[PDB]
Amino acid sequence: TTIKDLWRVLGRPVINGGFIVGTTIKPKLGLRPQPFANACYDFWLGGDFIKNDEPQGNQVFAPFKDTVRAVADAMRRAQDKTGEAKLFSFNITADDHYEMLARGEFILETFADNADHIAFLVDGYVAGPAAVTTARRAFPKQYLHYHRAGHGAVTSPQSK
Amino acid sequence: MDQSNRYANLNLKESELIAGGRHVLCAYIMKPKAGFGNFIQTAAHFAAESSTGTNVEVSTTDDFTRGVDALVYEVDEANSLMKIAYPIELFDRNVIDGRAMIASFLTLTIGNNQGMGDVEYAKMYDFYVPPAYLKLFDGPSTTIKDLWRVLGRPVINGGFIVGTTIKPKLGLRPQPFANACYDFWLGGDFIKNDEPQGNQVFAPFKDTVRAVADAMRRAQDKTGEAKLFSFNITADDHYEMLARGEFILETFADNADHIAFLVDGYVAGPAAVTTARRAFPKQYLHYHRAGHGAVTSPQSKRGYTAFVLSKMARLQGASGIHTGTMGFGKMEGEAADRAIAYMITEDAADGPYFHQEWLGMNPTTPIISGGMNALRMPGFFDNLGHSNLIMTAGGGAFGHVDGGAAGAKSLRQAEQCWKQGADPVEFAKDHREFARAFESFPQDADKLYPNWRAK
Amino acid sequence: MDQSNRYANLNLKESELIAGGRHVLCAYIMKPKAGFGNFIQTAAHFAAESSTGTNVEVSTTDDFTRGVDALVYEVDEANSLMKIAYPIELFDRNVIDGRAMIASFLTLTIGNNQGMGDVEYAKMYDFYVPPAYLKLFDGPSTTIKDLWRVLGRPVINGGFIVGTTIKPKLGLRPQPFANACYDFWLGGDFIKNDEPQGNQVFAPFKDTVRAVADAMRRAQDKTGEAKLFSFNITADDHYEMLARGEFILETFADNADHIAFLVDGYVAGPAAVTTARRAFPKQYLHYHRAGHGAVTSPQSKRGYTAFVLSKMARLQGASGIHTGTMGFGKMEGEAADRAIAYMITEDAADGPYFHQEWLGMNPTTPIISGGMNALRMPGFFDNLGHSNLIMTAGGGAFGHVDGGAAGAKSLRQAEQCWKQGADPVEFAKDHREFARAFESFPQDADKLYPNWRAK
Ligand SMILES: O=C(O)[C@@](O)(COP(=O)(O)O)[C@H](O)[C@H](O)COP(=O)(O)O
Ligand SMILES: O=C(O)[C@@](O)(COP(=O)(O)O)[C@H](O)[C@H](O)COP(=O)(O)O
Ligand SMILES: [Mg+2]
Ligand SMILES: [Mg+2]
Ligand SMILES: [Mg+2]
Fold first, then answer.
1. Which family does it belong to (chain A)?
2. In 3D, which of B255, B257, B259, B254 has the Cα closest to residue B244?
3. Partners for B (CB, 8 Å, 3+ pairs)?
């Protein structure tokens, strides 16, 4: 999957479809499910793309399924309001391969006719190539968002 | 009962329906049966039985239902033409991934309406899919580009892939089968299972696959060239399809990307094609269409055309599909079928009724097969205009007087001749295998190149 | 070119081929295209392209291949009849369980031969399967018997199942849909999804299943009788079919054995039917055949007949398949189609050309649908000879002047009328719901019972 598949969903030209306006939901952690979805709604009124901050997942104060449901609702309300398509990149990073599947499958089922508006984010450096490949091979039809948190430990020029 | 007031609106503009992007348009050649309704009444009933209605009024109908009625927006009784617009909301979607299914498109647009007692016949010649519906289809994940890469050819316009079908269609035991594979590969690139070849009692699946894997390695070592095979994994049982595919990929090991998977999509159905498409997206999906002639034939006035079948196949995710020899081979076909090739390869193309933008959806390769040989190829390429495709000649190769290997080279040389724009008879003078194709099929040479006995 | 020497042996006796039990026999109505070979030459080539050969001689052919050739063993040009014997060794088998697949049968017996350029048309009217091949097919695992048991009827000859299809075909949102279900169930037994109903954006699958499950519980409490529903689980993607099937069974819980699974077997293909058959063998498999008319119609001279389709469906494992209204409804059909019902229900039955022993393979129910109502039912039953079947009337029930519940009862009473051998008009005097069907469909009542308004 490429930006082209994101351009197509947005109704942009598939060749040089241009700039995708995005944000990361902040606070990095701490927003409970509905406050999270409200911020998503607010940004989508002016922007295209929203990613989970890299650690956001299934924290005790923001349960995964409740948060996904609220975000799906926010997407529908924002698209109804603006008349334009909106995208979200969900973090499905996990140690357990089957947890990654369970997260991805629930998201795609929840979003339903907006399923192709969904990207899957993987913390590829800390979880490893194995996590990246899990998402790549299980969900090839969903835009695979490689997040590289932790990479700086080696990639920094300070490192030799 | 007359349902034209509800299911017909000829004041609708086709250009506005397209621009709106909320409708699938279908163009039919339909004729009402005598002793029922007139053209519009029948067309209206047709639309109803294909969307929201039945043959009588029901109390359960509400205003929301009426909003999604399929509408007859254009008719031309003189040419028996009928055009229907389907609100895209009608078509079924997967619960698991929100994507489209061609089975739904088929059920509504060409299902029960094919059995209506008040219709004599009705055939779909074209359909239009808008972006919002188009982007929900799988589309091809693998293309000829990936075959070109394995062969070491340029990934852009990598050219002609010389192929064949193993003959006998059935009867070769595992090693005789593999020996035929080895022989052809000495001169050619591509080999497919004949469509019924699988796990016959006299040619067990695993033994045949093993022998062919060995044959591939021996041919690649001998020639120093990469070789391809398209294995039939068609089955009723989804898990049989997986088991066959998985064994093939494991057996071939480091040659696993040399493997294509063949599916008899028309008789086994869209479900079988999708099984292969979704389970093995990294393997070239070879859509074989055996049985299609029952409806696509011009002799038939029912079902859908070969154009329609090919266009559906692209949405389904076929890496390549058989498009026929366009009148140059043994099967029914027309030169005008070139338009079928263009519709499945280009990003923008014209159908008989609708222009289609594919929005960067991957192309489907035209696979040329059916009584082709070296002599018939130049004419075929002239009509199509390019050779960026797969062509197979079973009889044309193994029926070569000098054997399968020579047969393969005759196909290679035949395309080189067309590419060079040379005269076939003159070209043959400096190309033995191609020249020997004249003697292999003298009846063809006599008809195609009168007074060829120059040699 | 001329292959009659190899692929034709008219000295073969059909009785010995049958007694031999080593051949699948197929009967075609074929016409050669003008300007090619005669009948036997064309039939021979037909056999070649359907078994071991191609349109030319190949060097790879050995004596073993010659042994499994399909043979033309009978011809009658005057009647355009052609009979071919296929050695059962030709047909593909599963690696995983050694069982048969109908895809192979289709690919060989009615695949590529439907596109041959030298053939004008060819249609299969009958086929024979010998024991050695017959026993390798799944057959039905669930039958009407399992529905009768749920209803509390005798498991042998449990009688008529009063059914309907929910109309509008599409457009009812979840709760209006469930309301229509509840209403009909007050008078009827069985409800099926209209064939395209699934997971439309305005009627999400899981919400609809939930609403229908609630409707079933409410209707059963109210009536004190068991109620059945047949859900469409058709999809391109095998896993989409499973996801739908599993959710339904879990949702209905202690009513799970009240559930049938409907599959559009013709457009989705044999692969889809088999997915449901093998994944849910304990759930009634409802084979819906939308699209079939494109080949089975007598207007078509290609493909195969409805008889052939039905016979295959029994092998495939269909619990029931639509067999049509046999001329009494809105779809194309003839009274002689009664023979189709007999072939799929009995252990021994005659086809147009072949007698078939089924060796105790489970029966397939004749499912009657298409423009039926209370008024049309007696005539239909007279021609068939029994009412041990499922009949649905969508428009016939929800088009009833007093609503779905009254519609349901009118169908019940219509069958009660026929079984009692009473005169419909006289019977109506003491059965209001049935009498009100006359007023619901006055054009039907006028022809079927001319002076019904007098009384
Ligand atoms: O069985 C055959 O006849 C072929 O292997 C061709 O063999 P030859 O090369 O020996 O003729 C192909 O399956 C047909 O061409 C299919 O037809 P289409 O491509 O029209 O669907
Ligand atoms: O969509 C329909 O028309 C039906 O639900 C009948 O509705 P009605 O009762 O309102 O006519 C059935 O699918 C057809 O009968 C199929 O034909 P067949 O059984 O011949 O395959
Ligand atoms: Mg971050
Ligand atoms: Mg073939
Ligand atoms: Mg129906």
1. Belongs to the RuBisCO large chain family. Type II subfamily.
2. B259
3. A, C
**Contact B192/B230 with Cβ under 8 angstroms?**
yes
Give whole-number Cα distances, C417 to B309, C371, C394, C433, C452, in Å.
48, 19, 20, 12, 16
Residue B119, domain extent: 5-137
Shortest Cα distance, chain A CAs vs residue B413, angstroms? 38
- Across B104-118, b (16+ Cβ under 10 Å) vs e yields bbbbbbbbbbbbbbb
Interface of A with B (CB under 8 A): 4, 8-9, 11, 14-15, 105, 108-109, 111-116, 140-141
CA distance B161 to B155: 13
Pocket mutation for ligand 1, best pick of B162, B164, B165, B170 (most atoms within 8 Å of C-beta)? B165
Element (H, E) at C309: helix C306-316
User: What tokens appear for C76 in the block?
Assistant: 């009658």
Is residue C44 domain-shared with residue C163, that is, in the same domain?
A: no
Do C131 and C214 share a structural domain? no
DSSP B50-75: TTT--SS--TT--HHHHHT--EEEEE
Domain CATH number, residue B23: 3.30.70.150
* Residues C47 and C159 reside in one and the same domain: no
In degrees to the nearest 10, what's the CA dihedral of A102, A105, A106, A111? 160
Query: Which of A106, A111, A113 to mutate to probe the C interface, most C CBs <10 Å?
Result: A113
DSSP character at residue A81: H
CB C317 within 8 A of CB C287: no
Domain end position, chosen among B137, B171, B206: B137
Nearest-CA residue for ligand 2 atom 14 is C370
Same domain, B123 and B255: no
Q: Which helix (H) or strand (E) holds A79?
A: helix A64-82
Max Cα separation, chain A? 52
Q: Contact, C266 vs C304, CB < 8 A? A: no
One domain for residues C120 and C146? no
Residue C38 lies in a domain: yes
Q: How many domains does chain B have?
A: 2
Q: To one decimal place, what's the resolution in Å?
A: 2.3
Q: Is B55 in the pocket of ligand 2 (CB under 6 A)?
A: yes
Q: Which amino acid is at C268?
A: A
User: For the sheet containing B119-128, what is the strand order?
Assistant: B71-76, B81-87, B23-32, B119-128, B303-304
- Catalytic site residue from C227, C288, C292, C400: C288
Q: Please indicate, yes or no, whether residues C46 and C152 belong to a single structural domain of this protein.
A: no
Cβ atoms of B93 and A113 within 8 Å: the answer is yes
Chain C residues near residue A113 by CB distance under 8 angstroms: 201
Please report the atom of ligand 2 found closest to the CA of residue C329: 11
Q: Which residue has the tokens 């040659």?
A: B255
Q: What is the CATH number of the domain that holds C332?
A: 3.20.20.110
Q: What gap in Å lies between CA B207 and CA B212, rounded to an integer?
A: 9
C288 noted as active-site residue: yes
Query: How was it solved?
Result: X-ray
| Minimum distance, in Å, between the CA of residue C204 and any CA atom of chain A | 9
Residue B81 in any domain: the answer is yes
Atom of ligand 1 nearest to the CA of B370: 15
Name the DSSP letter for residue C387: -
B451 within some domain: no
- Residues B109, B147: one domain? no
Taking alpha carbons only, the member of B73, B72, B86 closest to residue B15 is B73
Which of B137, B171, B203 marks a domain boundary? B137
Whether residue B51 and residue C170 make contact (CB cut-off 8 A), yes or no, is yes
Rounded CA-CA distance C344/A49 in Å is 57
Selecting from B98, B131, B281 the residue whose C-beta is nearest the C-beta of A114 gives: B98
**C450 within some domain:** no
Any catalytic annotation for residue A117? no
